[PDB]
Design an enzyme around this catalytic site. Sequence first.
Site, PDB file in Angstrom:
ATOM      1  N   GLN B  70       0.831  -1.195   0.000  1.00 28.72           N
ATOM      2  CA  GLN B  70       0.000   0.000   0.000  1.00 28.72           C
ATOM      3  C   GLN B  70       0.870   1.251   0.000  1.00 28.72           C
ATOM      4  O   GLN B  70       1.931   1.290   0.629  1.00 28.72           O
ATOM      5  CB  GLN B  70      -0.926   0.003   1.215  1.00 28.72           C
TER       6      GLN B  70
HETATM    7  N1  LIG Z   1      -4.387 -15.985 -10.205  1.00 27.35           N
HETATM    8  C1  LIG Z   1      -3.414 -15.792  -9.308  1.00 27.35           C
HETATM    9  N2  LIG Z   1      -3.614 -14.981  -8.274  1.00 27.35           N
HETATM   10  C2  LIG Z   1      -2.526 -14.903  -7.473  1.00 27.35           C
HETATM   11  C3  LIG Z   1      -1.314 -15.525  -7.629  1.00 27.35           C
HETATM   12  N3  LIG Z   1      -0.461 -15.190  -6.591  1.00 27.35           N
HETATM   13  C4  LIG Z   1      -1.166 -14.388  -5.839  1.00 27.35           C
HETATM   14  N4  LIG Z   1      -2.424 -14.162  -6.322  1.00 27.35           N
HETATM   15  C5  LIG Z   1      -3.448 -13.306  -5.739  1.00 27.35           C
HETATM   16  O1  LIG Z   1      -2.995 -11.976  -5.797  1.00 27.35           O
HETATM   17  C6  LIG Z   1      -3.622 -11.208  -4.738  1.00 27.35           C
HETATM   18  C7  LIG Z   1      -2.560 -10.428  -4.004  1.00 27.35           C
HETATM   19  O2  LIG Z   1      -1.701 -11.323  -3.253  1.00 27.35           O
HETATM   20  P1  LIG Z   1      -1.585 -11.170  -1.666  1.00 27.35           P
HETATM   21  O3  LIG Z   1      -0.391 -11.905  -1.198  1.00 27.35           O
HETATM   22  O4  LIG Z   1      -2.872 -11.575  -1.052  1.00 27.35           O
HETATM   23  O5  LIG Z   1      -1.339  -9.609  -1.464  1.00 27.35           O
HETATM   24  P2  LIG Z   1       0.113  -8.965  -1.334  1.00 27.35           P
HETATM   25  O6  LIG Z   1       0.757  -9.163  -2.617  1.00 27.35           O
HETATM   26  O7  LIG Z   1       0.672  -9.625  -0.154  1.00 27.35           O
HETATM   27  O8  LIG Z   1      -0.063  -7.417  -1.009  1.00 27.35           O
HETATM   28  P3  LIG Z   1      -0.443  -6.563   0.271  1.00 27.35           P
HETATM   29  O9  LIG Z   1      -1.845  -6.956   0.590  1.00 27.35           O
HETATM   30  O10 LIG Z   1      -0.333  -5.171  -0.196  1.00 27.35           O
HETATM   31  O11 LIG Z   1       0.505  -6.884   1.363  1.00 27.35           O
HETATM   32  C8  LIG Z   1      -4.407 -12.231  -3.912  1.00 27.35           C
HETATM   33  O12 LIG Z   1      -5.771 -12.251  -4.302  1.00 27.35           O
HETATM   34  C9  LIG Z   1      -3.726 -13.549  -4.265  1.00 27.35           C
HETATM   35  O13 LIG Z   1      -4.574 -14.649  -4.038  1.00 27.35           O
HETATM   36  C10 LIG Z   1      -1.103 -16.374  -8.735  1.00 27.35           C
HETATM   37  O14 LIG Z   1      -0.083 -17.004  -9.030  1.00 27.35           O
HETATM   38  N5  LIG Z   1      -2.238 -16.451  -9.537  1.00 27.35           N
END
Ligand SMILES: Nc1nc2c(ncn2[C@@H]2O[C@H](COP(=O)(O)OP(=O)(O)OP(=O)(O)O)[C@@H](O)[C@H]2O)c(=O)[nH]1
Lengths: 431, 184, 1107
Positions: B70
């Site tokens: 963020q």
């Molecule tokens: N389709 C798909 N979605 C993914 C993949 N890796 C992560 N996501 C999705 O991407 C979104 C963001 O990932 P998160 O780890 O939840 O969020 P973050 O990247 O940690 O970010 P912050 O919330 O800002 O800390 C989530 O809805 C995950 O489920 C992937 O390989 N494929």
Amino acid sequence: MREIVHIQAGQCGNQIGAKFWEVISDEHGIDPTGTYHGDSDLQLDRISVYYNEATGGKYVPRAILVDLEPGTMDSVRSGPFGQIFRPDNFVFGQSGAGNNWAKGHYTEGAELVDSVLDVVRKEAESCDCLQGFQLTHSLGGGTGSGMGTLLISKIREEYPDRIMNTFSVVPSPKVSDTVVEPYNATLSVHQLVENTDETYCIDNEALYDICFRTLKLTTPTYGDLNHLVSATMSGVTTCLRFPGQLNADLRKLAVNMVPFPRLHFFMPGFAPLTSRGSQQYRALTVPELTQQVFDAKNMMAACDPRHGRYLTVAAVFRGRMSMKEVDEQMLNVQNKNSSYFVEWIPNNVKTAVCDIPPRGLKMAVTFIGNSTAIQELFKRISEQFTAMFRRKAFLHWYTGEGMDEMEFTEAESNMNDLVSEYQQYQDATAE
Amino acid sequence: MGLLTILKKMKQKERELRLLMLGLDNAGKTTILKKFNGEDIDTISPTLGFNIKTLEHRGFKLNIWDVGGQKSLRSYWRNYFESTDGLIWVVDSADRQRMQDCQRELQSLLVEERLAGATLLIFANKQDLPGALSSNAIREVLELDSIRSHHWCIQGCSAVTGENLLPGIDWLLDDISSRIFTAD
Amino acid sequence: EAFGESAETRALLGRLREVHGGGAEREVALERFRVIMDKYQEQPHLLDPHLEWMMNLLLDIVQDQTSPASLVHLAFKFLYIITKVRGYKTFLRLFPHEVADVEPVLDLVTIQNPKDHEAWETRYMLLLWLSVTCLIPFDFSRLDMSIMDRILQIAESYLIVSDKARDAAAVLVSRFITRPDVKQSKMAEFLDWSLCNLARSSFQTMQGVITMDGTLQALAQIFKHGKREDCLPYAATVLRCLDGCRLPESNQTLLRKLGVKLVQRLGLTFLKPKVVPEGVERVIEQLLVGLKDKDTVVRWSAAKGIGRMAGRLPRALADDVVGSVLDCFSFQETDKAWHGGCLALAELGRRGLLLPSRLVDVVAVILKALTYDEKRGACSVGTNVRDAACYVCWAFARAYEPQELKPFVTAISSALVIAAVFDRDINCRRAASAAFQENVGRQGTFPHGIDILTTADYFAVGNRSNCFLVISVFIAGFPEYTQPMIDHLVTMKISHWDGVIRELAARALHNLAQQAPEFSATQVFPRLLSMTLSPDLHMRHGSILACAEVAYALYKLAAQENRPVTDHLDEQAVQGLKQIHQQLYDRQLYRGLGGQLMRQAVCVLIEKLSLSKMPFRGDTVIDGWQWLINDTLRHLHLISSHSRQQMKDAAVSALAALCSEYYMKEPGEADPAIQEELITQYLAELRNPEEMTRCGFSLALGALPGFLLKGRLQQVLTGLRAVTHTSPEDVSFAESRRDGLKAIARICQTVGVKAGAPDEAVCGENVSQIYCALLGCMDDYTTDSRGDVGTWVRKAAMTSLMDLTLLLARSQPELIEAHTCERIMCCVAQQASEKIDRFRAHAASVFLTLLHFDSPPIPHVPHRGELEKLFPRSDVASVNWSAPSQAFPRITQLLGLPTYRYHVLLGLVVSLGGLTESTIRHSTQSLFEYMKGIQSDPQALGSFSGTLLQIFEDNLLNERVSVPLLKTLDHVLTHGCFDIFTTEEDHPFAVKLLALCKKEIKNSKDIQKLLSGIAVFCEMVQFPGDVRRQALLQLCLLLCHRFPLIRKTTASQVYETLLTYSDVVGADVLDEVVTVLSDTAWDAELAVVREQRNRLCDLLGVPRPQL
Ligand SMILES: Nc1nc2c(ncn2[C@@H]2O[C@H](COP(=O)(O)OP(=O)(O)OP(=O)(O)O)[C@@H](O)[C@H]2O)c(=O)[nH]1
Ligand SMILES: Nc1nc2c(ncn2[C@@H]2O[C@H](COP(=O)(O)OP(=O)(O)OP(=O)(O)O)[C@@H](O)[C@H]2O)c(=O)[nH]1
Ligand SMILES: [Mg+2]
Ligand SMILES: [Mg+2]
């Protein structure tokens, strides 16, 4: 002005030293801040023996605390009297000796032994004339057991003209369940015989039995034993901190109470027996104190003073008793025709009389004798040292650090020779 | 202090490491952290801070400090660059509209004095998607060839499917263990 | 391996909510938790798997708002213990770090009292927790007195706390002021707050120094965990304020350490971290001097600062720093300066800063540091500068390359292996071994780098004695570590202050000479022949020891090829072995404290020379050696007791080697001129009033060979027996009698056995006279002022009776008579049941060795089958005879045999009534176990009572066996052993016992003997008949003694006996006797005690005594 350097090592050693310093400070009239507030001029004619007169009329202790583990150090630093000890007189590491004598004397305790010598040497440089060093540790462990021996061996080479007094605390299976305690005690006694002029033995089994029976305490903790140890320490160092006719210094006392070089282990005691919390209950007299100083129950060791010869006897009285009243009582107990005559109170005994009484008590007494019964303290550890040596149990830990069976057999032979000499002297002609 | 104690203290620091994980929002960095340690993916929520995780792997102890993406928190990433041996940067391949929003922050993370020395590792996640850009396109859109004071190695991986997740950490550990000495 | 107390840990915490009110239970739990946690102080990385739940069971308690303060303090105690065990750095990563955990923690800390010393564990940990909540990436303004102001006030109030909480305030402010929103708000405020405290506070008070230390720690942590560009503007003001305080002059180590740590950090802020304001020029000026500090903690901290600063500065300044640090090794410095310089060099090389240009200089100093030992008094110093040289060498593996180190590898590898073997400190050896291993693993250009590590690994440089006779030879096996290794030992250890270093070095050279005989005979022996003229006392002893050891080694080597000893050593070197004695005799070096050492060295030298068959026979050198040996065996009391046995056992051995080598005319004979004078002088020296003269001459006369005893054996035996005899003048002569028997045993073992030759060896014509002398010394029980010294005379009297009995058994066993063998066996059995522990162990060992000897079996063994069954072979090494518990139960069983009954009982009586407590307690229990089996059989009890009465009659008016026997009789009667004799009136046994007791208590004055008599007289009232009445009368005679204590003890014993046995007095008169023995002061004047005595006599039916 004869100064004495007090050193503390190991958890038990530091816990005993802190209590002893607190006791001798409360008895001298020194608030926990550092200033003086007593009500007696006699509490300052000899304060320089254990306190340095810093700027501002303050009295800085001379306790050098060392501990490989950062445990008791922080506790003593934030204690009721932690603010008194100099802050650069604390020397510690992180990991201790792991209940191994070959760790706190060769690989670990010899890593801070150099910082200890620098500290004890920086503390003695300010003194005008040093008399003798002091150490308070427990034979049980590695930082108390090996560090004390290492320091005693290292200081004797640089200060051979200084007295070496210690306060060994022999462990007991009742207080601790550790199995590597017999070896640490044997190796400590091996070094405490050839490089020590005096050693005050404070067995733990004796204090445990006292707290179990006499005090009738539920679960005797370490505090109950530490209180008695500090009381005995304060009662023993009465002539070296207060005036009196018997101006027996450290060297003079060691020469008059230790006729032999190897034989130097005493059986310190103190009466009346008390505990924590309340204390005022019954006021004792001089006859009752004399009858109780010489009882095996008031002794802090599991030995019977009656069963064995009497090398040297000494007693220190504290309260409104006069050396004339004491002499009258010490000259009728060494006579059979005299009534209430005792057979275990010997002749040619040393006797003292103090003015300032102890804390929470108006009259007390301390006994510092050397009887052959102390041999029992050396045999109890011998058996436990042999049964475990035949099977070579827990010996790999010692052989890996650098030690070998040579030192073990040397210590065993030394202990056997000491026990034999004690038994031989026990049967000696009185006249 | 002796040589034995110095060696014992240096071994503890050589075996233990710290990996600072960063990335834009919804970049898939906590979905990759949970998979590396073996946890559930259907119970992840938008984190609004920092998460520390200690785990043993190949004898080493990986202390992964993962921070969100963020913007409000981007002004507080200056409290994680201390004692950082590795810098992991997550990049969403499907977010080809904010590849310059991650290039503007990548050019401000390497110039840091604290991070000047740590090994960088770019993880291009979201590869199984239909409109997912390959690693070659991301290497050119982010301008990775311009970097020279850091040992980078852009690699394409996935979280929900798990592809090339072990080699990414293996290469980072091999590169961190190759250094004979470090600054202080 | 893993944590195994977790099963007990989760239960302990479960009881935390119940033992919070009680003090004893809380202390037991706290102590228990501490003893459970301190076991893994060496393995802190083993508790990490349990750091998750273990924390949830603690912080969850304080989080509950419905809990008292005692429980919170108890939980914080466990939290602090866990932090101490593991570590705050690795444990605070588990503490809550949410924005909703900050205001909770703040109020928690604010609810504390800094004056409460008991709860110090709550204030020290709480602060740390706050630091965790300061890691959130949120602004304090969003949470909303403000939070930032409250945190600043708390830090300022805690930074001057004398307790440990001050430390907790260091890591806190280090993370609160270094924030984006708080490094532009609270940083300047805390900066004007620190400057004021540093300018106002002084190092003369306890509170002024505490505040200074706190401020210095806070500043050092801020400049360490703070932005370089943010803390750069305020880098000059802090430096000036620190310089204006004059910390180096203060007498505080922690203050100087913190000042150096702050100065190095400030200097690191001026330079940019790359792979120079004028202010930096001062920083370095404050670091170099730090290496010449008195304390090692200051040098260790300054070394890191110097190493970190040389890497952020240019290559011109980097070289200047090394050049300035090299000046510390000048000729006008101490060991601390060298230690600091070595530490700085190691810190610089660890980062890769030393250039190859400084190779000729650095290498020219480390060679001097690995062998640093400048005597600074009785002991020498340098062990600090040596441990630092090891680390310095360890750094070259990472700095220079093989191409740049090859020219100096030949000298570095040799020095490392030289310092990793013969070092006195195990730590230095381990450090050198680690450095060698690191150099071999990285560079890999060391001669035999792998072969040297396999034999000298981390688990091989432990035993110092093993490194001088195992690793030294292995290293000398190669031609690259032989001549320098020998030169080092010759020019360093053999000239050391300690004597163990001059003995170990000689023993190592003894083996080293085997692999390099030419170098040791043509290059090293001349250097040891000239070192003897050294005025140094430690130098002469070492040179003599080396000359002896190398000579013995060369002789042993030549003995292989049956070649003479003069092949290796030339005649010039041979003339030195003859003039060494003249040089010592001319200068008169046999005086003072070093005289004994010189004599001991010359004795070993002469022994090793005679054991090599040198060409010295028929020269004045032999006469000089004999005169020196006689003078040493003539003046023994002048030597200290701490080294008398060594001189006594070495001189006799040297004389025997000389008398068994040089003093011979032909095979089987000797020079009569020397035989007619040596024996005569010795026999004229065995009658010397001084006891030490005989103690040394007896062994010297006994150590002579067998060919030198031919014809003069009877005279020597008579002279030795004349000393073993006790006389009015020789009362306390125990050491002389011991040596008299030792020499006789040695002569018997040497001459062997030969029939038809009483003057040449031992035979049936003089074996009886020899056995008579050995059996007579066993009865010696002298009690001098020192104590029971006679025991010593018995020790040598036992072994002398063992080795002899075996000798005949290996030649003419028929000479051993039956009566003599039985007497020896009974005496050994008696000696194996004595209260003493060291002597009883040896007695039992001798008994077992004599019983198990079956090659051939020894004749005249009383009850041989019973003795073998009661003392099997397996019970020899497993049973500890020194322990009474593991000895008395097995020795008491011997009473079953007839022969082993009188002597065994006489020996056990001393242990059953001595002074020691444990021995008596064990002997009584062992005797009761045997008596329980012979309690029903009247014949066995009668025989035992008869033997006891006979022993009592034998040792009458004896204060050695009478008191122990009387004491044991009391226990025997109290236990109830003679219960069958109570069913008969007028028992002769009890009559004779009472008669003997009355004899022993006749005019008894001492109170120790009176107590046992009174006890026996009161324990004898059990026997009815005339023994009951008469015995009672005796008690009356003790109720009006000459001392009040005796009367009181007699009254107490009578009262106890009246309660024990109720059938002794009728019930009608028992009340009166009980009332008269209660309200009566037996310690008053006899005028009133006589009336009570008469009243008691009139009631007990005892006739009125008469004066
Ligand atoms: N389709 C798909 N979605 C993914 C993949 N890796 C992560 N996501 C999705 O991407 C979104 C963001 O990932 P998160 O780890 O939840 O969020 P973050 O990247 O940690 O970010 P912050 O919330 O800002 O800390 C989530 O809805 C995950 O489920 C992937 O390989 N494929
Ligand atoms: N009387 C008494 N005995 C104690 C005390 N603390 C420990 N002991 C005993 O001393 C032995 C343990 O030695 P410690 O002093 O704890 O150990 P250390 O000297 O710090 O050594 P390491 O275990 O190597 O760290 C055991 O026999 C304990 O019963 C104490 O406060 N009082
Ligand atoms: Mg400890
Ligand atoms: Mg996330």
